[PDB]
Amino acid sequence: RLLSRSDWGARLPKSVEHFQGPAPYVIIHHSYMPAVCYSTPDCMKSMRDMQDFHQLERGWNDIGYSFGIGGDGMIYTGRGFNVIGAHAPKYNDKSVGIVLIGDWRTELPPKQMLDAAKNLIAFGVFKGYIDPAYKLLGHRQVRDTESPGGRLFAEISSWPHFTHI
């Protein structure tokens, strides 16, 4: 279920900065725009659209997230493991930031998206990129703290590793 950056046709990063040791945090995001992607070709386009917005419109080094999750249930590599992100203030150098593609302000993502996120986390721990005792957070805990978080936040609040901050 894991697609590399070259698999979705990513532009190279402008610059890459690494952080050391396994990430102590996992942070769950949604894209808002682009909207939910239904097939692998559509989700590859969603990843390029986010990268283009972050690199070309905002002048950032790369798509801000570590990984994306499509409606196809696939995992898309963004900056990847142990790369400083641009997704969560105070956590960019100590987390894996996972974006579920789509507008998940209120609605619950489909199961294959939730399953892909759990599989990515398990993979990251198994390969030594995520701390085994990682802390799981929602974006409304670290970044947009007045966002209510919706059914997605309620869902991740029930997962093992979910942490109050």
Residue numbers in the entry: 14 to 178
Reproduce, without paraphrasing, sentences from the article in which this PDB structure was first reported:
Drosophila PGRP-LB belongs to the amidase PGRPs and downregulates the immune deficiency (IMD) pathway by cleaving meso-2,6-diaminopimelic (meso-DAP or DAP)-type PGN. The structure of the PGRP domain comprises three α-helices and one central β-sheet composed of six β-strands, similar to the bacteriophage T7 lysozyme, a zinc-dependent amidase. The main difference between amidase and non-catalytic PGRPs is the presence of Zn2+ in only amidase PGRPs, which is coordinated by two histidines and one cysteine. We generated mutants to characterize the amidase reaction mechanism and solved the X-ray structures of wild-type Drosophila PGRP-LBPA/PC and its mutants in apo form or complexed to TCT.
Our results show, however, that the activity of the H42A, H152A and C160S PGRP-LBPA/PC mutants depends on the substrate type and is either significantly reduced or completely abolished. Y78F and C160S PGRP-LBPA/PC mutant structures were elucidated to 1.30 Å and 1.40 Å resolution, respectively. Both mutants Y78F and C160S PGRP-LBPA/PC share a similar fold with PGRP-LBPA/PC wild type with a RMSD on Cα of 0.49 Å and 1.12 Å, respectively, but in different space groups, P6122 for PGRP-LBPA/PC_Y78F and P1 for PGRP-LBPA/PC_C160S. This deviation is due to the loss of interaction between C160 and Zn2+, where the cysteine is replaced by a serine. We showed that Zn2+ is totally absent in PGRP-LBPA/PC_C160S mutant as already observed in the structure resolution, while it is still present in PGRP-LBPA/PC_Y78A mutant and PGRP-LBPA/PC wild type. Finally, the addition of Zn2+ to the reaction buffer used for activity assays allowed a small residual amidase activity of PGRP-LBPA/PC_C160S, whereas the absence of Zn2+ in the buffer totally abolished the amidase activity of PGRP-LBPA/PC_C160S, which is consistent with X-ray structural data.
